[PDB]
Write an enzyme that holds these catalytic residues in place. Structure first.
Site, PDB file in Angstrom:
ATOM      1  CG  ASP A 100      -5.075 -21.916   2.455  1.00 54.94           C
ATOM      2  OD1 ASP A 100      -4.116 -22.643   2.760  1.00 54.94           O
ATOM      3  OD2 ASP A 100      -6.266 -22.368   2.355  1.00 54.94           O
ATOM      4  CE1 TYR A 132     -16.682 -22.472   5.340  1.00 53.41           C
ATOM      5  CE2 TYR A 132     -16.547 -20.263   4.356  1.00 53.41           C
ATOM      6  CZ  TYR A 132     -16.121 -21.208   5.309  1.00 53.41           C
ATOM      7  OH  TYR A 132     -15.153 -20.922   6.246  1.00 53.41           O
ATOM      8  N   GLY A 133     -19.204 -24.805  -0.233  1.00 53.12           N
ATOM      9  CA  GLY A 133     -20.047 -25.259  -1.321  1.00 53.12           C
ATOM     10  C   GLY A 133     -19.230 -25.651  -2.532  1.00 53.12           C
ATOM     11  CB  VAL A 139     -16.318 -24.881  -7.908  1.00 54.89           C
ATOM     12  CG1 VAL A 139     -16.008 -24.107  -9.175  1.00 54.89           C
ATOM     13  CG2 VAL A 139     -15.802 -24.127  -6.669  1.00 54.89           C
ATOM     14  CE  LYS A 186     -15.921 -19.057  -3.720  1.00 53.18           C
ATOM     15  NZ  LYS A 186     -14.584 -18.693  -3.102  1.00 53.18           N
ATOM     16  CB  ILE A 198     -15.707 -27.435 -11.555  1.00 54.28           C
ATOM     17  CG1 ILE A 198     -15.968 -27.042 -13.000  1.00 54.28           C
ATOM     18  CG2 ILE A 198     -14.218 -27.214 -11.211  1.00 54.28           C
ATOM     19  CD1 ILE A 198     -15.559 -25.628 -13.298  1.00 54.28           C
ATOM     20  N   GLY A 199     -15.869 -29.156  -8.862  1.00 59.63           N
ATOM     21  CA  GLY A 199     -15.078 -29.390  -7.659  1.00 59.63           C
ATOM     22  C   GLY A 199     -15.675 -28.639  -6.486  1.00 59.63           C
ATOM     23  CD  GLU A 200     -17.390 -30.073  -3.493  1.00 59.18           C
ATOM     24  OE1 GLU A 200     -17.912 -29.211  -2.760  1.00 59.18           O
ATOM     25  OE2 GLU A 200     -18.074 -30.864  -4.169  1.00 59.18           O
ATOM     26  N   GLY A 201     -15.449 -25.546  -3.315  1.00 60.49           N
ATOM     27  CA  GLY A 201     -14.988 -24.419  -2.532  1.00 60.49           C
ATOM     28  C   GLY A 201     -15.109 -24.726  -1.048  1.00 60.49           C
TER      29      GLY A 201
HETATM   30  C1  LIG Z   1     -10.873 -21.053  -6.551  1.00 62.32           C
HETATM   31  C2  LIG Z   1     -10.579 -21.476  -5.107  1.00 62.32           C
HETATM   32  C3  LIG Z   1     -11.106 -22.856  -4.765  1.00 62.32           C
HETATM   33  O1  LIG Z   1     -12.241 -22.976  -4.336  1.00 62.32           O
HETATM   34  C4  LIG Z   1     -10.220 -24.085  -4.924  1.00 62.32           C
HETATM   35  O2  LIG Z   1     -10.687 -25.176  -4.151  1.00 62.32           O
HETATM   36  C5  LIG Z   1     -10.207 -24.566  -6.377  1.00 62.32           C
HETATM   37  O3  LIG Z   1      -9.202 -25.585  -6.525  1.00 62.32           O
HETATM   38  C6  LIG Z   1     -11.538 -25.181  -6.843  1.00 62.32           C
HETATM   39  C7  LIG Z   1     -11.517 -25.431  -8.351  1.00 62.32           C
HETATM   40  O4  LIG Z   1     -11.631 -24.163  -8.992  1.00 62.32           O
HETATM   41  C8  LIG Z   1     -11.600 -24.067 -10.367  1.00 62.32           C
HETATM   42  C9  LIG Z   1     -11.177 -25.154 -11.102  1.00 62.32           C
HETATM   43  C10 LIG Z   1     -11.114 -25.099 -12.509  1.00 62.32           C
HETATM   44  O5  LIG Z   1     -10.681 -26.153 -13.245  1.00 62.32           O
HETATM   45  C11 LIG Z   1     -11.453 -23.964 -13.170  1.00 62.32           C
HETATM   46  C12 LIG Z   1     -11.879 -22.866 -12.421  1.00 62.32           C
HETATM   47  O6  LIG Z   1     -12.222 -21.720 -13.054  1.00 62.32           O
HETATM   48  C13 LIG Z   1     -11.962 -22.911 -11.048  1.00 62.32           C
HETATM   49  C14 LIG Z   1     -12.383 -21.677 -10.344  1.00 62.32           C
HETATM   50  O7  LIG Z   1     -12.577 -20.611 -10.919  1.00 62.32           O
HETATM   51  O8  LIG Z   1     -12.382 -21.746  -8.914  1.00 62.32           O
HETATM   52  C15 LIG Z   1     -12.810 -20.604  -8.181  1.00 62.32           C
HETATM   53  C16 LIG Z   1     -14.322 -20.499  -8.278  1.00 62.32           C
HETATM   54  C17 LIG Z   1     -12.389 -20.831  -6.710  1.00 62.32           C
END
Ligand SMILES: *[C@H]1CC(=O)[C@@H](O)[C@@H](O)CCOc2cc(O)cc(O)c2C(=O)O[C@@H](C)C1
Length: 346
Positions: A139, A26-27, A29, A44, A21-24
């Site tokens: 934040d 320290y790792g 997602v 995450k 999906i993307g990035e937290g």
């Molecule tokens: C939510 C805080 C983060 O880590 C942010 O960087 C966030 O933008 C990451 C993307 O998180 C996403 C994106 C989605 O499209 C759907 C989600 O369910 C989530 C999510 O639950 O992020 C959580 C894990 C961290």
């Protein structure tokens, strides 16, 4: 273990069929299928144990979210880690799978006024709960606001949160870095450590402006540029507001600037609802003592279609002090994270 883009993502066998999906912090997602609840979830991965500061951020978020329960705060559904401290190298936090985050959404979608109103209502409703717990998020920004497919909103990432401490908030000029730059209140650069609730209201104001136009309202190019952008729109602070800044370096920096006129909100946002702009103005007030508070913002006429204090709950058990994570070496912090995550074993 299953692997995502070359990296261990050790969540199985309950959680399968992973997608990046993307990035937290320290790792990464990922989304995953929860074979027990038969729904896809977000996961995450966190790898903090080599750094004290990373362990602090991980532990604070877990402590906070294991206590908080609120519809506009994304909770912790599960936590995955090895059974022993010796074997534990990563921690995975399992949360509801949302559809998108507001950063991505605003890159390509224009919001209707009804969407802006509903999103803003939900941000403030979640924030009312957070602040009622004596906690500051610290934040808030579009990427920490998640939306499901029916536009329900949840606030993400409590790794930078703190217990509010308004009596110890004062500090010197150009020393503090709280929040993400574009969402940082002017006093952070002048005389504030970021330990009062008004820090979060400023960020929400920046988010509202950004929903009105799909562009950040104060896009500072670097740390020092940020205050240029704020003052360029708000104009020069009043004598009264300067007199509230007792620190000489900060006050004299402001006094050294040429006069700057306020830019009218309706000139920046000619399509906006006039009530939204009135609320925007109250959130983006320069003097943090005059800035609107979360419960006043919920009561503002822009939100009248949604406002209902009996349906805007507060926390049962506010946090009374910060857990005191300073100076704790990462070894004790690892042991504390192991302890705080035990409830999810086996
Ligand atoms: C939510 C805080 C983060 O880590 C942010 O960087 C966030 O933008 C990451 C993307 O998180 C996403 C994106 C989605 O499209 C759907 C989600 O369910 C989530 C999510 O639950 O992020 C959580 C894990 C961290």
């Amino acid at each position: 273990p299953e692997m995502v883009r070359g990296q261990v993502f050790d969540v199985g066998p309950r959680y399968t069929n992973l997608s990046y999906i993307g990035e937290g912090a320290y790792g990464m997602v990922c989304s995953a299928y929860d074979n027990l609840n038969k729904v896809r979830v977000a996961i995450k991965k966190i790898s903090p144990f080599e750094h004290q500061t990373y362990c602090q951020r991980t532990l604070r978020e877990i402590k906070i979210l294991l206590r908080f329960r609120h519809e506009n705060i994304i909770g912790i559904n599960d936590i995955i880690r090895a059974p022993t401290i010796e074997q534990m190298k990563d921690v995975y936090i399992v949360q509801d799978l949302m559809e998108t985050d507001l950063y991505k959404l605003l890159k390509t979608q224009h919001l209707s006024n009804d969407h802006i109103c509903y999103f803003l209502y939900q941000i403030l409703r979640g924030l009312k709960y957070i602040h009622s717990a004596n906690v500051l998020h610290r934040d808030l920004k579009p990427s920490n606001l998640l939306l499901n497919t029916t536009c329900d909103l949840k606030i993400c990432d409590f790794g930078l949160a703190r217990v509010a401490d308004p009596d110890h908030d004062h500090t010197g000029f150009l020393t503090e870095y709280v929040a993400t730059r574009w969402y940082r209140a002017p006093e952070i650069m002048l005389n504030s450590k970021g330990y009062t609730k008004s820090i979060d209201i400023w960020s929400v104001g920046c988010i509202l402006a950004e929903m009105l136009s799909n562009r950040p309202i104060f896009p500072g190019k670097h740390y020092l540029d940020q205050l240029n952008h704020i003052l360029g729109i708000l104009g020069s602070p009043s004598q009264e507001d300067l007199n509230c800044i007792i620190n000489l370096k900060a006050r004299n920096y402001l006094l050294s600037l040429p006069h700057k006129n306020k830019v009218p909100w309706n000139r920046l946002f000619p399509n906006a609802d006039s009530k939204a702009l009135d609320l925007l103005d109250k959130m983006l007030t320069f003097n943090p003592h005059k800035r609107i508070e979360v419960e006043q913002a919920l009561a503002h006429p822009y939100l009248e279609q949604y406002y209902d204090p009996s349906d805007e709950p507060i926390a049962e058990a506010p946090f009374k002090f910060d857990m005191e994570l300073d100076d704790l070496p990462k070894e004790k912090l690892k042991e504390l994270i192991f302890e705080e995550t035990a409830r999810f074993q086996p």
